[PDB]
Design a protein around this ligand. Structure first.
Ligand SMILES: *Cc1c(COP(=O)(O)O)cnc(C)c1O
Ligand SMILES: *Cc1c(COP(=O)(O)O)cnc(C)c1O
Ligand SMILES: *Cc1c(COP(=O)(O)O)cnc(C)c1O
Ligand SMILES: *Cc1c(COP(=O)(O)O)cnc(C)c1O
Lengths: 458, 458, 458, 458
């Protein structure tokens, strides 16, 4: 009978992947690490760190833990400091969703939010505010997960021995996502100390990060990636930092959850792809132990959601099956399959009236058609674009009252209404917008803004 | 005691204008013609026309009058055919407002509406439908106010004699708006028959019409103007067709109502301006009798409304007084003086997120500013325009996930917030949109579309 | 050649009504008075009043005319003071529409608006503000159309003589709307002075006014009616104040415009109905000269509009023809003939969920039906009314989580969907709302609020 | 090195609760069961069931698994049938959220949704559709988790032995949530077979279910509860079914996650409360092993969300701290702290106009105040309620045109604007709505519907 829930942190199993790695390649054992009571791998470091603050006497009993959290370290820190009874207060960037910090609260942590995207060194970003809280509050102890030797030491104590024992001293490689830099350092250091120099440590890094040799970048895979060299990552340990893209990592995570029964996150997919790559230059008899460090339940609406995964130019395929059943006509069915009367103007109306219709119906383009009856057979006289009108009106090139026929641009190209949205993207790749001619007659205009707004919701 | 209300049609007074004509010029007598019981001058022709259908036996008792109406001829035709008891049915273009045809109904006329802007010779325009009604109904009699000699004959009988008698055979000129062509023909013909060739007939025509020698045009002044030669306008009568613009005619109508106590319409202002012009080449001792043919009560929301009169690039000044106490900041106060926190993005957000904010807030431009706190002192890093983004995203020049800082355009110019809207127009005459820096900090972006949308409502 | 437009004020014709008065009754001559250049009868008094201010020296040249206007007196005052050149400034209640005061401005009058419905004797109503303007401005002259003897004197001079001459001293009665009290006083006084006591003066008054013996009332017919005794109405003149209702006056105005070719207003209809009534107790050989004092062009959207005329429980019939073609189902077609899915709940859902659906869809009643498929054949289990739920929830009689089946009221009655809206009114006269069963299945619920909201727009 | 991820299902730890159980009571060991690879306890049964279909030859290789899922059994069934390679297809009620079935898909399961709340025995509910799928598809095998002996047998094999071994044959009681009825049956049967009759099995059941002796009820705690007797629950095993309410279970779950570092669900809280209750009649030396069967990550927005937890009359306190900082005035700040103003009417306006304002502003009550200036000092003349008006208007008791002062109800009571929302609830408990008098003047009316709409969002 365990004494607290934070005593079961460790000894996580070591299962193997048998359907993602190709045939004729070494063994890939994925050290599933989302079975910890805290949900992620960060629990390991958490425990160790707290222990230090009790041995070094640097965290007097009843003191408060202050920390600029990421979302996973907070979970473990709360889960443990709640056993000891230390009040915990985080300072989180508003970039974190409501569910994540709601969990962070449910564990008994006080989360004070501050704006984001501001420079880290100014009073707005959460680093300076965390320092200010450290000053004001008494008995504060900023664990500083980025420059804390205990971080990597904890993995050196209780992540290498598991890797070395579950395989019986037979592990050719050890690939692991390198984020803030504790898992690879504290694990590879021990794997090398206990195997001479046999097991070559490899570290996967999101494409275009500091470790991978590139410059900064906006990062999507939560966890891995950095813009500076953490004080707790000795760059001498890893032997090959194999960088991997973002689309590849997300697709690998999805395919892993679908073909191996593991709900791993983004960094997990990145690590698995880095492995499956390194597992080629190591022929048969190779044993690559990847470190899947998260559980893919928090991302359930972030990378398993075809909508989000499609907004960021991603989503090779859909989770359930067939690819693109929706056709361009459905882009027009925002009113529940209710293609409204083709907002149209005639070669005799007034430029002011054309601008009026454009403003009143929200649309930004309209085919001037020679018959108010919306039944024209592809013989629309021209096209009027609100931008072009406003330009010709504010540059004296067209009086407000002038007839529209003297300032209308050439007609805009046409695409069928029963054609797939991928074809619509391919087409709009070259023009600004185009009218959908549904069995002879036009029924509206699909435009870049509208297509890219539809992709991001359905 | 008159027998019917349609017996008082005629003998309308002849008042003179004494504040619009400059000093040192002849006398200008304006034959106010909106005192007829039917409201306009068309009553004259109406009566005559009906009489013909009773003498020529071409309108059997109990028959129906069918006519593609304009709005004034309908009033007189109803007012008279209601005395005789003839059912009247009009076919009106939807271009006519609700008040006009509502009046046309209140007199007991049946108005059947058809779409407009369609060619006159097709089954959609009201000419063909009027002919179809003439066929179907029995005893129909299409008066055809455009090719009816009785039209001009009525003015020859009861509009020249009034002009010739109220002035005692002393009239140098007779200027009159020339629309469908009865008032000038039937009046000048008599003025010449009874004065040899002394009184030189002049006819005003809206700028760019058939009579003025130009080609077709979208017409705003209701009444005057045409696109073809009516069969009832003998072009030999008028001696000088002095064409006048639209802004000039509207301004003259407004100034006439303000400085002469006459609520005349648009054609009235056109005729008065044509007079005031011809009254220069006729030195002292000239007596120009203009024919103001309408009453400016129907246009009360069409040319006396600063909003409408400003949408069509018009409105030199406002009715009441000072010019432009508008200011550009008020363009931002669409939420009741509630500047909207300035939608912005930062040099680190994702292109997808910038497009997201643009779509979500409706705005089409946004300043990328290096601090989420909306307090920047004119040091915004750049500007992002939804069009430019969507272009760089659908042309492969920018991944959806790429940082915005790599695809942001140069900053957009600035204008004060306490500056008049005329200055805003002068500025936007050269750029696409500009941010209003209100005492150091920016508070939004005013754009061509927004300014031209505000002018048309306030 | 008149010298100014305000010289033609007077001598308005005297036409007779020959289709509204029944058979076997005296002659009814309606002194049409909307042919004055200013549009209404008030011009008469206006002229006279101004003359006084010039003879009595009480209005020094260049002085300003201040007046709490009604809408017609302003027109005449502007039309004349613009001839003299006196700056005119009105103070109008916000109850006046935009078109009326827009006209009042177009004539060159400065209209300063103040809130309405406030007591007349306080600084908010326009009487006190008019007095304040009289104090501040110099040379001000508040004509005070309510306590000015010149008002009735003007009609005594130039409205009785016309009535007495156009009929050749043969007029049995003279009925005229009695509003502020000048037309009846100044006309009947002369008719009696010049006919001994023969011509019995009659005065029509809106039902429930001071003159008719009743108490105050909210007045709709613009003009006639008062809440106090004006200082310029000698109650000894009129011999019978025959009060008339509002619906009767509006219907008489409409029928007059349709069967006599006169666009008279509301007071005109009231006067005509009062006449047609008095013309019964005066057998053959009676000559009743009604005084139609307004022109029905300003009300074109106030009493000739079936929408407005129907909101105030009016509108016996429609202007054009057949009565009530719209059927109850069209009340549901607010989404363009798009029945809204029939928001429903089931006997197992939670009271919280029922309140949720009610709030989310705006509706206030919903039939609990035993099958989510909206195809039930009139076997809906019950009805839930948001009010009843909220009551049973805030009075502890139903937990938020309790099943709805324990707090649902009896079903609400049903009416067909192809039945006329008049039937719907007759039905809702007894219940709170009822579901429209369209050929077996229900398709929604029409409610008092919805029906009375539809009547007021279509 | 495990062979598949579904080999680690079992041997879940047995941690003890040391802060929720009061002092002077036996030991409470909570067999945390959310550490299974599939997330919940259902994995156990899942494995066993699949094994049967392979030994009994009742699931031919390549066959499809059809099952009307709940949300947890689906996870385990997918996780295992994906190891064997059996296509899995679920039929889920639309009551399940998007995240749950999205997870269910990510594992490679085909989820076909059908409407809910329909009777289970009809073709609309998912039972009949599941049977239809069993018929159509080939090799189908409906596991039927409700009438499958293997269900309870699996817990008999691998849930009792763990309970009996982790405690060394020393367990006085075994309390466990009783839902579909496998955990208590298959565990208590073994605990009794191996301990004579010592360990008294107890089973917690949501208040008002079949097992607890009550009738049906709408159930909120996902999992536990039933409306019929499952064919796989032998009611002879449990010795005391201690029923527990819903609010109690949710509060216990929240307090457990906050004071024991366990994110358990709803059934977990119910089981823990049932334990903490039974642990009173068992003095010192008692060892109650509760069975927490779920992980509280899916409910993160269902019971840890103060909004949802407050809509269903719940939420004793908030997760973070102080109770009700929001005051009634904030209920009015739906427009971002911008009380619209104070829609009002005056004792002279028309009933039609009062109904008009009510309809136009959405509000359902309005104080008739004797001064349009919204500055009245608590001297509002009356109150008008749209319902009352519409009633008095459709029952002939008030003409549309009648003055409002004759049909206005007594004023509605007042409450301060800086008072807490709990006070507002206490007040509205007795009236229909009340106006908030903010430092003397009124600033609006808060109504039951508005308060209960605000509670459900903030
Ligand atoms: C913490 C974390 C990692 C590993 O970070 P380290 O650099 O090893 O400390 C990987 N993925 C995710 C999602 C993480 O949160
Ligand atoms: C009819 C009309 C005229 C005169 O038209 P004619 O060509 O003389 O028949 C001028 N102005 C308006 C507004 C008219 O309606
Ligand atoms: C002024 C007016 C009257 C007549 O008012 P008096 O009391 O005669 O001065 C009648 N109807 C209307 C619409 C009016 O404006
Ligand atoms: C399955 C389940 C249980 C236990 O159900 P049994 O009746 O033991 O089969 C308890 N809680 C939840 C949330 C469950 O899903």
């Amino acid at each position: 009978i365990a004494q607290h829930i934070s005593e079961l942190i460790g000894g996580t199993p070591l299962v193997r992947l048998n359907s993602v790695v190709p045939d004729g390649a070494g063994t890939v054992a994925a050290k599933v690490e989302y079975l910890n009571p805290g949900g992620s791998s960060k629990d390991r470091i958490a425990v160790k760190m707290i222990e230090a603050a009790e041995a070094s006497g640097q965290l007097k009993p009843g003191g408060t833990i202050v920390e600029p959290t990421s979302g996973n370290t907070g979970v473990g820190l709360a889960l443990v400091a709640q056993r000891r009874g230390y009040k915990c207060v985080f300072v989180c960037p508003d970039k974190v969703s409501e569910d994540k910090r709601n969990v962070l609260i449910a564990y008994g942590a006080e989360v004070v939010v501050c704006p984001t995207a501001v420079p880290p060194h100014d009073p707005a970003s959460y680093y300076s505010v965390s320092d200010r809280l450290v000053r004001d509050i008494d008995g504060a102890w900023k664990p500083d997960q980025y420059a804390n030797p205990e971080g990597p030491a904890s993995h050196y104590v209780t992540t290498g021995p598991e890797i070395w024992a579950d395989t019986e001293g037979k592990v050719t490689h050890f690939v692991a996502g390198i984020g803030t830099g504790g898992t690879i350092t504290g694990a590879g250091r021990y794997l090398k100390e206990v195997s001479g120099g046999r097991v070559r440590i490899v570290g996967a890094d999101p494409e275009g990060s500091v470790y991978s040799g590139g410059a900064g970048r906006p990062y999507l895979v939560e966890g891995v990636g950095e813009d500076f060299w953490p004080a707790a990552y000795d760059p001498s340990v890893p032997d090959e930092i194999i960088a991997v893209s973002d689309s590849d990592s997300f697709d690998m995570t999805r395919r892993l959850a679908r073909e191996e029964a593991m709900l791993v996150g983004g960094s997990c997919g990145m690590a698995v792809v880095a492995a499956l790559k390194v597992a080629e230059e190591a022929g048969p008899d190779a044993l690559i132990v990847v470190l899947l460090p998260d559980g893919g339940r928090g991302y359930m609406s972030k990378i398993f959601n075809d909508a989000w995964m499609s907004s960021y130019g991603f989503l090779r395929s859909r989770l359930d099956g067939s690819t693109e059943q929706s056709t361009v006509g459905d882009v027009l069915r925002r009113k529940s399959g209710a293609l409204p009367a083709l907002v149209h103007t005639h070669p005799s109306e007034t430029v002011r009236d054309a601008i009026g219709i454009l403003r009143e119906y929200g649309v930004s383009q309209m085919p001037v058609v020679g018959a108010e009856p919306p039944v024209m057979a592809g013989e629309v006289a021209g096209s009027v674009s609100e931008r072009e009108l406003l330009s010709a009106v504010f540059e004296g090139r067209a009086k407000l009252a002038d007839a529209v026929s003297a300032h209308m641009s050439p007609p805009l190209r046409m695409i069928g209404a029963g054609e797939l949205v991928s074809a619509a993207g391919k087409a709009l790749r070259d023009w600004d917008a185009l009218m959908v001619v549904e069995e002879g007659k036009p029924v509206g205009v699909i435009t870049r803004y509208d297509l890219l707004g539809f992709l991001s919701e359905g």
